[PDB]
Symmetry: D2
Subunit: 332 residues, 4 copies
């Protein structure tokens, strides 16, 4: 049995996570789930967004499935639940996928999470400001090895996007990426971000595993969303040494919570990434989504008038149908 | 008389600049032109891409019209002609325009030229790399005042795009921009580059004067070109204290030089920026271009089979036609 | 029983440490000693200057008494034994004492050990070099609290020596020292190093606990030795959280090893610091040294022709004599 | 005729400068003097410590003789007169001499003046502070060439004192000093400041031309004064491209102004440096001072009860006596 920690969060988080968990249960009985509370209410009651004993159980889980959390502008002493989990679980890498639901093409963008690669300081001393940024071989290797394993797993290659023409840290990172990839027999292409943005708009689907330090990579990960009809479809993973946390890119959207119209696709595809991470059949979820959207009604963020449940049921129906066609969907 | 220094350059530079100069002569007799050589051939013969006595005459001119220059990968001692001119003439600001030729809408992107705003160092000391970047109030004010005057002139506003969330230099620059704009009664909007990229793809034409330090602004200035059918239409200006140099964004394209198919629109619209800069009727050039492209055949980079001359003549024809319609195109 | 780990080292280290241990045994039976090997010979046989199992026993000891170690110019893979121990035991503070043996006056100089306070990088990128240095509140507080406890223990005060006029890190450190001292009711004087050097030459004995970051403090700790007849008298301590290592400032002096002329005073006074650290009667050692030097013959580094043993015996004789005078040397 | 600009300053400045000028007039008629006002009174009357028209005349002079200036703790808008002159005249190098008046031995210490070599920033962003320091080849060469010419002129060598073991800027500077010296056939010794301080106390007179960046070199230049009976004897020069300003190290000492007890030796020896700088007979001044102090009464800062005038007259008497002994003091 794999043990998955479930952290629904706030607002639409619980709604979409219910859909994702129901989908996972429809594909495999090899996972069981334990649920945990986190957010402002937990902070009020214990001084931290998540309880220390819940964190300990989470650390020992095989994967985490996370919904979304509402973080107030200024609640003294409070720190974002997702930022806490990334820090406490050592989740140094973030992998975002923009899927083309019609075809199964994707844009894969790997960056470090906050403080996962660079450090240093910024300050004013009026009349002048300074920023210093430092990167090490050890930090560069760690994220390079991750992206390299991800490319290997996909039968793919790396597109390393950067500003090595201006920033020596980027030149350094590029060299390390090329070294690590070379060891593993994985092709590396590289590009200056400025011109690469044109390619990401015009030819998005053919860049393999995009890797960029987050100063530039977070630009790419947002720019790539122009190819999604809604942010509500977009999944992501947060990866560390021996554990990963999967979450939709969308937020807690408190203003539509309880309206039954949250897009569950992002959370459901995040579950598909979770299954892949555990060596299970994430592809069945993707094929089921693609099947559903051919003629299936979608939620209002995608221009349809489905309820969340209509989409969750319709996806589960596709999964069922595939699982029943023993000749068409064979094991492994 | 205004005195304009003309520096045709190499490859297609002379071809497109001939078109631009012919266009300028069609709108005004208040400018006369002096021509200057520059590039590799001048370097071979005198050790610098441009002669020191030619530079002196150029410094005293009212504006510079520049074509394009071929810069070899490694010619020991050689330094790019356009980089030399930016440096020697103190051209600290670059303003790029992506025009919508059907309508007259535009995307205006202001960044500093190389070393126009930030300084500091980058280095490796293996196992670690560092970058330090420094900005001052004086440098920030200078480019802010430029963008603010540009917004005032356009009856517009500034969209300041940045990474102030990560880089203190950007926070500092933002504050200075807001101060200078506030003094001049010019509205400032600001945006983090990551999300702004989505707006620049989806709603490009309604951002006023975009200002961004070049580390991010050069991303924007390339990304904005997705809205141009060809780079060959795109003009730019390089501005300093008391002189400016106008040039197409396109390069010297030596492989099509002499084929009579270079797009002259970028150079011609750069001439239109030059006329605006001198207080002359640049708008007549723009209206003439827009008129020509309604039904006019375009060069092969825009999917037509016109020669450069067909487009140059057709534009001049429009200018003539407008200048003859005394009721439709009145003075000032 | 207190448990002291003894690491004699090389050259004269074993010779002087024998004297120190014999002295400690003459004052107290409340300490027992365990001996450990370390240096090049241990490296040859196990790839590290000290065995990992010996380190583990050392970590659990109450104090460490260290002689001196010979570190070759370049022995690939080798790292100094004393540098290893400082690192592995987290010994962030170094306290050097220059004693006036005639009187019992002292110069006390506290600095951080390597990387105990500042970090950052230095690099060339030819034509330019850069150094970046970073200090944090947490690191500044830690060494400040140490020096403050040391001043309290001595019934003294802190002289904080710096270059706050030039380096912001020093200004920052000074402010933290003043805050911590203020909390504990300990007086802080401060001085720019440049002028302070004159006072340290002319009036050395009246500065209390001198505290300076090592960039300047290591200058002071060497300059202060002009008041010692020989480096061979000078003790020191290396302090961490819950353990400390005491060692003479002198080195392994392999060229006089076996000649029976090494000055044992530095090691013996380092033992006296060790006893103070454990709450035992270090003062008895100091009084015994002072008594011996009144008329006692000293080793050749101090202009006498005593052997090491003559001095060790003569000191132990003084200790014995004091311990026998129950009216003159009373408990506590 | 050489033209020397005289800037007496405040307090004891006028008193000691009168002595120096009288001494110069006693050795040569090849100099004439023009006097200029500067300080707080000039600031009150014109918004700058020195008048712009006086600065212009000063720039064209062959040398400057400067007394001392009183700089208030906080007079809004005011900037130190000597700091202004160093800046405005481009006086990048400072050479301090500690003389042994009994013998004619000296300690020569060369450092850059403020911002003469290093730049960069220091800042807090609370919880952390940073300092960045940058040096260039061009700045390093400039001061290296100065110290190298000074060593050549003295028939001497350079002792380069530094912290190259910790600071890469120092390592860089050391390499440049070694290169420049090597070209000119001048020996370079180098030393880490920490240990060098011991040598400067114990063996001060045998280090040739000491060169150190001011972060460390200003330590040395103060520490070296332990070998002077009073700061009042110590001269200095401030050197730039084509002009130099000579001044005593002592200050304006307003509390003894008008008491007739200011030591004129520092100013007089600064005049001797001025004459050397112009190719004139500074040595005659030094020999005359040394002669006077053999049995001559000195001012109260040196433990005598002479008035300033007694010392000025006694020195001039020695100069006269030497100039009359045509066999003992021959030309050149
Ligand atoms: Na999210
Ligand atoms: Na161009
Ligand atoms: Na030692
Ligand atoms: Na002075």
């Amino acid at each position: 049995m794999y043990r998955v920690a479930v952290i629904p969060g706030d607002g639409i988080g619980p709604e979409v996570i219910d859909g994702a968990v129901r989908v996972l249960k429809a594909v495999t009985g090899r996972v069981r789930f334990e649920y945990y509370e986190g957010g402002v209410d937990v902070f009020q009651e214990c001084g931290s967004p998540i309880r220390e004993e819940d964190l300990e159980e989470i650390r020992r889980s095989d994967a985490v499935l996370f919904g979304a959390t509402t973080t107030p502008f200024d609640l003294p002493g409070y720190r974002s639940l997702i930022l806490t989990l990334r820090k406490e679980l050592g989740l140094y890498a973030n992998l975002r996928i923009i899927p083309d639901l019609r075809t199964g093409r994707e844009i894969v963008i790997v960056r470090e999470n906050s403080e996962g690669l660079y450090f240093g300081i910024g300050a004013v001393v009026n009349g002048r400001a300074v920023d210093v940024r430092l990167i090490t071989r050890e930090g560069a290797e760690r994220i390079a090895r991750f992206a390299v394993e991800q490319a290997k797993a996909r039968g793919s290659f790396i597109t390393f996007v950067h500003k090595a023409n201006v920033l020596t840290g980027d030149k350094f990172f590029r060299r390390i990426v090329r070294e690590v990839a070379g060891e593993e027999g994985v092709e590396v292409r590289d590009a200056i971000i400025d011109s690469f943005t044109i390619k990401l708009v015009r030819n998005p689907w053919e860049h393999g595993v995009i890797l960029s330090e987050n100063l530039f990579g977070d630009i790419l990960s947002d720019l790539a969303t122009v190819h999604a009809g809604s942010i509500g479809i977009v999944p992501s993973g947060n990866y560390g040494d021996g554990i990963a946390l999967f979450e939709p890119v969308h937020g807690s959207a408190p203003d539509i919570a309880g309206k039954g119209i949250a897009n569950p696709i992002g959370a459901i595809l995040s579950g598909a990434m979770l299954l892949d991470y555990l060596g299970l059949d994430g592809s069945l979820i993707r094929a089921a989504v693609r099947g559903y959207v051919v003629n299936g009604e979608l939620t209002p963020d995608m221009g349809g008038r489905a309820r969340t449940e209509d989409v969750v049921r319709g996806i589960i129906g596709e999964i069922e149908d595939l699982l029943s066609m023993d000749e068409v969907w064979r094991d492994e």
